[PDB]
A paper describes a structure:
XcSOD crystallized in space group P212121 with two monomers per asymmetric unit. In the case of XcSOD the two monomers in the asymmetric unit are related to one another in such a way as to present all of the hallmarks of a dimeric enzyme consistent with the SEC results and the crystallographic symmetry. These are most notably characterised by the lack of the large antiparallel α-helical hairpin composed of α1 and α3 which is typical of tetrameric enzymes. Further analysis of the amino acid sequence also reveals that XcSOD has all of the residues previously identified to be fingerprints of a Mn-containing enzyme and therefore was refined as such. The Mn ion is coordinated by Asp164, His81, His27, His168 and a solvent derived ligand (HOH304). The electrostatic potential around the active site is very similar to that observed in other members of the FeSOD/MnSOD family and presents a halo of positive charge directing the substrate anion towards the active site. With respect to catalysis, XcSOD presented a specific activity of 11609 U/mg, very similar to the value of 12800 U/mg reported for Yersinia enterocolitica SodA, a tetrameric MnSOD with which it shares 57% sequence identity.
Found within a gene class designated "pathogenicity, virulence and adaptation" in the annotated genome of [name] subsp. citri strain 306 is the sodM (XAC2386) gene, which encodes a predicted [name] (XcSOD). Superoxide dismutases are metalo-oxidoreductases (EC: 1.15.1.1) that catalyze the dismutation of the superoxide radical (O2•-) into molecular oxygen and hydrogen peroxide (H2O2). Depending on the redox metal cofactor, SODs can be classified into three main structural groups: Cu,ZnSODs which contain both metals, MnSOD/FeSODs which have either one or the other metal, and the NiSODs. Heterologous expression of sodM provided pure, homogeneous, catalytically active XcSOD, from which a high resolution structure was determined by X-ray crystallography.
Author numbering:
A (entry chain A), B (entry chain E): 2 to 202
Amino acid sequence: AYTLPQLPYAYDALEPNIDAQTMEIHHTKHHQTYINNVNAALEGTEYADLPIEELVSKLKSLPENLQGPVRNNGGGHANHSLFWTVLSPNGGGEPKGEVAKAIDKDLGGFEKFKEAFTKAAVSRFGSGWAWLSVTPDKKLVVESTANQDSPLFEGNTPILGLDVWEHAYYLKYQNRRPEYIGAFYNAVNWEEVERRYHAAI
Amino acid sequence: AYTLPQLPYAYDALEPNIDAQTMEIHHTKHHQTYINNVNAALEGTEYADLPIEELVSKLKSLPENLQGPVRNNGGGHANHSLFWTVLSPNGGGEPKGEVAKAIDKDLGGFEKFKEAFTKAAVSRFGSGWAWLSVTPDKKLVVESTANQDSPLFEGNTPILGLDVWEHAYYLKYQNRRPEYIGAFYNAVNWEEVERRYHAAI
Ligand SMILES: [Mn+2]
Ligand SMILES: [Mn+2]
């Protein structure tokens, strides 16, 4: 019974970092499709009324005939829902508050985090995501996942994510993913990232 | 070392099925990069003077440090080299010769083959390829692979392939991968596919 969340901003609010056409297609076409696909698979089951984050966390405990649809399409839903919120037309800059202090203590500083985040995003071959996550031991880790796999079913709570599927950047950047990653930094909503960190802890 | 093969046709020869801009970017940027990367990984090794298909076939026997680069970038080189040859500005229609008879005997007919090929191409979640391949027992199979994985290192010989990485279709088709798959049928060079079948025997 999931529905498409409204973006916190207009489709063209992230220019010149992300083009308006991509934001609209990514939202109304790609994200909608994940939501429709997981809704059809969950219909008539006892798992149809769970929050998306809880469902994806319990992936391995689901029946065999549901794991495929939930991993890919439920994964797509949770990941893109998070993605839209950690971007902002007034984003960029450096983190502050406790996420800054956690980045300093856990990852060795903002400059080291970006080095690791960029490497993870560049090194993901094929479709996937780069993540900053909170572990069960309440520490930050940088990681990447394939396709729509989410750190949620690995026990981690992602607080920042970058979509590196080619549909997220090909219209404006074509093959130049490093350039796209550089633009992502200019749009990161660190106030939202701080919010998610407080909740994960 | 490997070098970028010239296309058998102009960059706009496949219109209206594949756009000229994509053909140029796909060839001169994406394929070139695979070639550059696998050449760098092979430099100074005992594998630097092998045909790419032989190299990719022997993937599982390569040293650990070479398996990643050859799988992804050598796979990328082999897959795209095949791809360019099985497209044609005068393609489409139905297969003929020995591959046609094999499609009837092994796959149940051209209509059944397209049904299976389309399903494999549509259902490949993330980046990948849809394939018509010849098995070690010399029969036809429809299959799909992830990223640049090639049926070659699983013992199969691909004779026809469709790239369903989003970079292969997003500029013209955006999210409409089914539309792209339908157009691909119009551009297939079945004369080349027959040659590849005969060579696989
Ligand atoms: Mn996406
Ligand atoms: Mn390609």
